[PDB]
Design a protein around this ligand. Structure first.
Ligand SMILES: Cc1cc2nc3c(=O)[nH]c(=O)nc-3n(C[C@H](O)[C@H](O)[C@H](O)COP(=O)(O)O)c2cc1C
Ligand SMILES: Cc1cc2nc3c(=O)[nH]c(=O)nc-3n(C[C@H](O)[C@H](O)[C@H](O)COP(=O)(O)O)c2cc1C
Ligand SMILES: Cc1cc2nc3c(=O)[nH]c(=O)nc-3n(C[C@H](O)[C@H](O)[C@H](O)COP(=O)(O)O)c2cc1C
Ligand SMILES: Cc1cc2nc3c(=O)[nH]c(=O)nc-3n(C[C@H](O)[C@H](O)[C@H](O)COP(=O)(O)O)c2cc1C
Ligand SMILES: Cc1cc2nc3c(=O)[nH]c(=O)nc-3n(C[C@H](O)[C@H](O)[C@H](O)COP(=O)(O)O)c2cc1C
Ligand SMILES: Cc1cc2nc3c(=O)[nH]c(=O)nc-3n(C[C@H](O)[C@H](O)[C@H](O)COP(=O)(O)O)c2cc1C
Ligand SMILES: [Mg+2]
Ligand SMILES: [Mg+2]
Ligand SMILES: [Mg+2]
Ligand SMILES: [Mg+2]
Ligand SMILES: [Mg+2]
Ligand SMILES: [Mg+2]
Ligand SMILES: [Mg+2]
Ligand SMILES: [Mg+2]
Lengths: 186, 186, 186, 186, 186, 186
């Protein structure tokens, strides 16, 4: 089958509305009731929870990513979303992990970090979609035998959306990517 | 200076009481306001809930640990736990991660998993104490800037537990374990 | 930039005709004259040459891929292609390399082989697409300057075609994936 | 069951006495016929020699640790040690090895060194206890089939020490640490 | 089998003439007609072709070795060689590969790059000798069946020549080094 | 300079006498008073100590290599050699190390083990010469700023001899190989 795909001329927040727009169509065009978003402030899971219904999992950065100790999400939004039925999750990025701490001391690269860099060959959002997909799968916040739409972007906002089948951390290479709804061309 | 500890003859189930009680006593005698433990069902964290004050938390097996998309913390028990007034988490085990995915796929081991296995030299329960310890910190729950008490066990119980100032994954090795309370001798 | 993208219900040689047609169109659309294509036997290379014009580079399997000291590409087929003006190349595979020799001897996985399994979560051709892009660049057979259309498939023929900018082995992570002309959905 | 241990406020030199004395007491109270320690000069093993019965041994810094081909165990002290009636060794540190060669050359870390760093979370002195522990066993000296007492320290002393049934390198992970005696809290 | 071996006091282009002469002799002696030679510019390849007969394969640097999208081998020099019957080849370097792209991005070392530093403890050419042997085999340019004379040097010209049996990338450790015709002693 | 080298038609013990014979000449032809042998039973360091004088370091397998616990060398020969002025050493093989234990559990390969396999491309003895060279350097049993002759072989006896400059474990890639006295051609 032939479907439309949107290539953002440039990566970034400028693109957040369109991405959420295609997510709506596709999701309905396919009957996907499972959504996984990368929202650190929450501005995205929110804008999405008011355009679709079903299962919205919002993943934010791990505790202390900008400044050790405190997490960039305030239970202030963790409620503005917990009200809308949106699941809220903070955990360790599955495509960095501890190998990240290591490489921070010693300065090399662990195997999963290479999975990330490779995925960033298409776009940054492309990589996070896969990452959050795994995170939620393992956190039991989403199915591993049903398609799902993961939403991500470059730094803030959204510019990448994928129709994919999550896989758990121990069966990570089972994760399949079915369709690319939107992505930054660069 | 000085303090006190204990040593199990053989590993297992039949120790969480002795562990718990003692882990509690010591836990209490030491005096802190932030905790963490490892129950794949919840029981062992059930017995714990009613003997401490502040922040208990019961990380469990990431979904799919046994069968794709099947966390074990029964919602009957999840409800129970959360209700008993104390936090619940499920995420990817900080000391294996996607790493275990690659290994399950290819047949060797990654850095991160090297660690679990080191720690295990002492006691299987020894490592989990660090594993779950780290996850908990990453979920924005427990501190990395004050002491916490780590409790865990081997196979089907809760035989080991320590005292450390856990840490995140991007600065992992900044983890400082401070005291041992109990552990299987072998 | 909304465009079309074909999702093949299943992977395989059957899709070839459609992907060769789709590349033609996208090439005219973007003004691309560089094509790198994985063709073990050369058949796929042959077809493509008849629908597209410019620099076509066909890379076959490395000698020894199936039998020690043996090249799968028949002398006749090579001759036929070179007669048409298609640069034909063969060399150790970019996303496995000597790292595979190592694993065939010791079992685990080397860093470069992980990049490939990671690319595979999209499709097999998706992985050959960047792989042959790297090989062709290093051979000096295609530019790492401008855009190129990369074509790959599952074992026989073709089912994946990408629009990308190659990069050399020493600067792999400088490889950019721009558009997915077609890909097997599974 | 149960036993006793201790906790240093800050790390160092000023503890080997307290350590030693106590490491001895406990060492004695526990009763065993095979020992091992970490003195880069020999002193700390001097103080030890006269307080135990059976097999003491004093592994030191591999030659070139400071300057090419310069072991530190002064022959004045080597003579002393060996004379005092108890074994002396010098070899490559079991938890870095050529690995550290590669890292010094390239800039990351190898499996083996991953371990040292894990162990160090507790105390720098914690790891050496395993390092020298393992070397000693490999030199045909101390047993892997009975308990041994491991003593070591941080910087310029002897602050940590354990009880384990060490192991070889070809079957390393079969190492079973059994008891803690003393250690720097941080 | 007592034979001669030349040890050059120092490495470099100066030794070329002697190694080209020595290979000639050893080739007659053993009845070898396969030669793989590292010649970036092609000069060295040119000389060799005039003293030896049979299949000569000259491998130059991969495109991008010095400047993005650039091949060091001049079109003129290639032409000259091919005019003489010397198979000329270029492709990503066998003992670094994409593993170098990775390190250039993250710093440590990949497994394949260690093989090279290890080969280098003999001389630089010693390392290019097996490296170009692997590349030529995978290109199907030389056999992994019989013996071949491999020629390499330090940056310019030649100072190392080996008698070996190539092997493919997937069976690297099947590469056999038989005789060292000449090598820089340092 | 042009020197003779012996290529054993086949690897093994059959070759032990010749190797020791060339060692004598070369050593004298060069003024090398430092010898490093790989002798597990001791049959070799012995046969050598009676044909040369200077510094003979005999290295045997690490404790329990065939059968954990006990070392293949009896203090019976450890004296028959300790009498002849020969230094006797048992330690952990520097080109295996702990990574060896790991790979024994998990089944992959660590970096140093790859250094070994690579070196075995020329001969097995070639590899051990480098290994024992390192072992002794670090054990302070030999110089790191003077040439030395390391002796090794395939399984038992000797068939490989190298004139090389040892390097310590932390500067391993400084080790230089100057001359190859004898080696098995296969
Ligand atoms: C687990 C997680 C992983 C992320 N990693 C990256 C990353 O690799 N690179 C990147 O450009 N953005 C990354 N992001 C950003 C997301 O793509 C997205 O821009 C952001 O979370 C949206 O938050 P906002 O709604 O507050 O803008 C990450 C954020 C999360 C939650
Ligand atoms: C994240 C997590 C990690 C664990 N890893 C291990 C492990 O590697 N080794 C082990 O033997 N037990 C492990 N456990 C087992 C538990 O610590 C322990 O068996 C517990 O008793 C199970 O809880 P339950 O008794 O309440 O069912 C792990 C459990 C959890 C939650
Ligand atoms: C270097 C290279 C690597 C390739 N690796 C794969 C692979 O990873 N997976 C796969 O399904 N096919 C792979 N192939 C096959 C191509 O994707 C493709 O199926 C091609 O059509 C074979 O050509 P043919 O139809 O002329 O026989 C690769 C081919 C080459 C030349
Ligand atoms: C093999 C060996 C390994 C060691 N590694 C470490 C290490 O990684 N961390 C550390 O801080 N001290 C290390 N040490 C230090 C000693 O355990 C300790 O400082 C000791 O006091 C020095 O002996 P001395 O006081 O008799 O001179 C090491 C020493 C030896 C012999
Ligand atoms: C793929 C390949 C890799 C090589 N890598 C090295 C290297 O590792 N070290 C080095 O000193 N020279 C290396 N070279 C250069 C050759 O060893 C050699 O010096 C050659 O003479 C250059 O040829 P020229 O005299 O025609 O310019 C390599 C050359 C190629 C083609
Ligand atoms: C540290 C050490 C490393 C060795 N590793 C190998 C090896 O990698 N492969 C091999 O074929 N022989 C190996 N050997 C064997 C030696 O090359 C040599 O044959 C033997 O030690 C001579 O002992 P013998 O005099 O009792 O026969 C090793 C022995 C020692 C001492
Ligand atoms: Mg935003
Ligand atoms: Mg892009
Ligand atoms: Mg224990
Ligand atoms: Mg797909
Ligand atoms: Mg401590
Ligand atoms: Mg040399
Ligand atoms: Mg023998
Ligand atoms: Mg040989």
């Amino acid at each position: 089958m032939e479907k439309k795909i949107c290539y953002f001329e440039e990566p970034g927040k400028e693109n957040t509305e369109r991405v959420l727009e295609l997510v709506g169509e596709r999701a309905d065009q396919l009957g996907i009731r499972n959504f996984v978003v990368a929202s650190v402030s929450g501005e995205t899971a929110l804008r999405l929870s008011e355009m679709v219904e079903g299962n919205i999992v919002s993943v934010t950065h791990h505790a202390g990513f900008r400044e050790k100790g405190q997490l960039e999400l305030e239970d202030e939004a963790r409620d503005a979303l917990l009200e809308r039925g949106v699941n809220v999750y903070a955990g360790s990025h599955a495509l960095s992990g501890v190998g990240r701490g290591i490489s921070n001391r010693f300065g090399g690269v662990t195997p999963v970090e290479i999975m990330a860099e490779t995925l960033r060959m298409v776009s940054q959002g492309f990589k996070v979609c896969v990452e959050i997909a795994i995170m939620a799968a393992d956190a039991g916040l989403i199915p591993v035998d049903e398609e799902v739409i993961a939403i991500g972007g470059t730094a803030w906002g959204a510019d990448t959306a994928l129709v994919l089948t999550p896989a758990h951390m121990n069966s990570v290479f089972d994760l399949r990517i079915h369709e690319v709804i939107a992505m930054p061309r660069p």
